[PDB]
Design a protein around this ligand. Structure first.
Ligand SMILES: NC(=O)c1ccc[n+]([C@@H]2O[C@H](COP(=O)([O-])OP(=O)(O)OC[C@H]3O[C@@H](n4cnc5c(N)ncnc54)[C@H](OP(=O)(O)O)[C@@H]3O)[C@@H](O)[C@H]2O)c1
Ligand SMILES: [Mg+2]
Ligand SMILES: [Mg+2]
Lengths: 323, 324
């Protein structure tokens, strides 16, 4: 795959389209605001009222989801993944017309087929590689967040151009687009956040914190050693890969990196990651997530309360206040 | 342990002291410049070369290491771990006097006793938690970088005040100080970078990249999902802990974090980390590093050439090129 930019957006397919953004949270506010600034005709569809109000104070024509959908040619669904199916069936599906296009910023519901959009309606995706605040902030600074785009079903023959023009309208084409599929986006995105970015990383940090504090080292000092000082390291990797990071740290640190990294992340850990990937591919994780929501979020409830009680989180809150 | 600030620096112990900074790399430069703008009296000692004349052109009275040490009451050694011992024995040790204070910004050589300073000389530490350019820049902007301080041996009774006043001089007390010991600073610093920050992290990213690419997913896309996107995640944790990060990500991502993190980092991984800590505490890692260095860095050489061949590094350099 080769990276694409504004010059690669052959057709301004959002030209003459009424656009409805559904929802107004992390991604919702960012997409709507960026597209508006880009000159697109954008309305908001959302439930009352604390996303509804902010959207109307931000100057948007704000309707119910059903009304916004009925008015629109292009409908981008930016409600939480767990509620998209019920919301789609009740409020969106009845108000679609042939030739419409439905968009997502993550392929979960379409790929796992919790949602099935009619055959005469396009389904596309623009998936920015950052939360909404960054998607918005970078845009405002004349910049952007790179994005993936994909098409799940192309009824009109215009679906790919709609996806790429959406990317352009939100600023992503300023810095780089990569084409993918709904399957690849969904599976790689779930895997990355689970095994490495969020799950893997927080568990790694917490394990390191436990080993130090259980060994008798001060938690305040341990906080810096496994969390606070991570930002400088990851900024280096972001800028110049492992190469730049390892050039920048001391030879003692670099040698420790090479020797101890493989002691910690072993072949068995890689097999653990393969099991995580398997449950993404086979629909188990997806069903577990949706089933937790349907049951009243009991697992998410226990996890959130557990995470609130972590010593590293208590200590870190105190230290970040003291700085 | 409670964080300390400028109000907790009880004695201006560097008052009237002749301060020599050994080394004029980013670290040496930062400490020296900061102390000068804070109103202290600093000279630089370093071998002849680029740094020597940059120091001379920076306005510092610049000498060799031997002569800077001779003139100074307080000698801060800011050179790489691997050259400190040779440099100390040859140039510094024969020029120390009773009542002097020797400083370090990391405890490796003093803790593992590759260097033994005479018992009528103080040994202290100020260890800012950032690289030289950041220590300088933050100070120039009017704040600083937080720091640990410690004392290994106190002959004069002034060693702790010297350490804390040094911290104050380089701007660290503006933002926060934590007292530690040479042993704990050294062991925690080695452990953190080995098990979590550098070793664990790069190995985690690489394993994830391998799992995706071996399963047939595109490497360019995998680069974003295990490496590029980590920066904003860690930025969030830096600013607001796991809590802020998990608020920003989708509920889908957050649930995946809670469920899958423990499947990847298991009890056995924690035991692996305990083994890493053990080799730090028992001197085995320290000896292995020094022995590799004395032997011409053969392990370091093989490791570096292997790292240069990683697919994620080749794909990544190309993508970062494509994203100015
Ligand atoms: N969050 C990220 O960083 C991120 C990154 C990449 C991709 N994505 C994807 O983008 C999509 C949305 O993510 P998100 O973080 O923006 O979710 P979010 O933070 O939970 O935002 C949900 C928004 O939709 C509103 N809402 C709740 N129920 C609604 C309903 N029936 N009808 C209309 N609006 C409703 C919410 O208003 P209330 O507050 O009043 O409930 C809120 O404003 C997901 O598919 C996600 O995978 C997210
Ligand atoms: Mg992800
Ligand atoms: Mg995601």
């Amino acid at each position: 795959v080769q990276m694409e930019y504004e010059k690669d957006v052959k057709v301004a397919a959002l030209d003459g389209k009424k656009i409805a953004v559904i929802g107004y949270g992390s991604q919702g506010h960012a997409h709507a605001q960026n597209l508006r600034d880009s000159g697109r005709d954008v309305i908001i569809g959302v439930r009352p009222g604390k996303s509804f109000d902010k959207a109307k104070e931000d100057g948007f024509d704000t309707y119910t989801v059903a009304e916004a959908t009925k008015l629109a040619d292009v409908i981008m669904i930016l409600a939480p993944d767990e509620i998209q199916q019920e919301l789609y069936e009740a409020e969106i599906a009845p108000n679609l017309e042939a030739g419409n296009a439905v968009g997502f910023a993550h392929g979960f519901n379409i790929h796992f087929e919790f949602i099935k959009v009619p055959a005469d309606v396009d389904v596309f995706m623009c998936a920015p590689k950052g939360p909404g605040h960054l998607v918005r902030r970078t845009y405002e600074e004349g910049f952007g967040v790179p994005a993936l785009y994909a098409v799940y079903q192309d009824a009109t023959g215009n679906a790919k151009n709609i996806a790429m023009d959406w990317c352009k309208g939100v600023g992503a084409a300023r810095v780089g687009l990569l084409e993918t599929t709904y399957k690849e986006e969904t599976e790689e995105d779930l895997f990355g956040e689970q095994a490495v970015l969020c799950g893997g990383l927080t568990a790694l940090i917490e394990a390191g914190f436990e080993v130090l504090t259980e060994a008798g080292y001060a938690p305040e000092l341990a906080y810096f050693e496994v969390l606070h000082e991570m930002k400088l390291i990851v900024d280096l990797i972001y800028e110049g890969g492992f190469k730049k990071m390892r050039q920048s740290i001391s030879n003692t640190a670099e040698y420790g990196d090479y020797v101890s990294g493989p002691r910690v992340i072993t072949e068995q850990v890689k097999e653990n990651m393969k099991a995580v990937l398997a449950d993404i591919q086979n629909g188990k994780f997806a069903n577990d997530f949706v089933n937790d929501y349907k049951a009243g979020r009991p697992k998410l409830t226990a996890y959130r309360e557990q995470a609130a009680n972590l010593e590293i989180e208590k200590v870190g809150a105190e230290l970040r206040k003291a700085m």
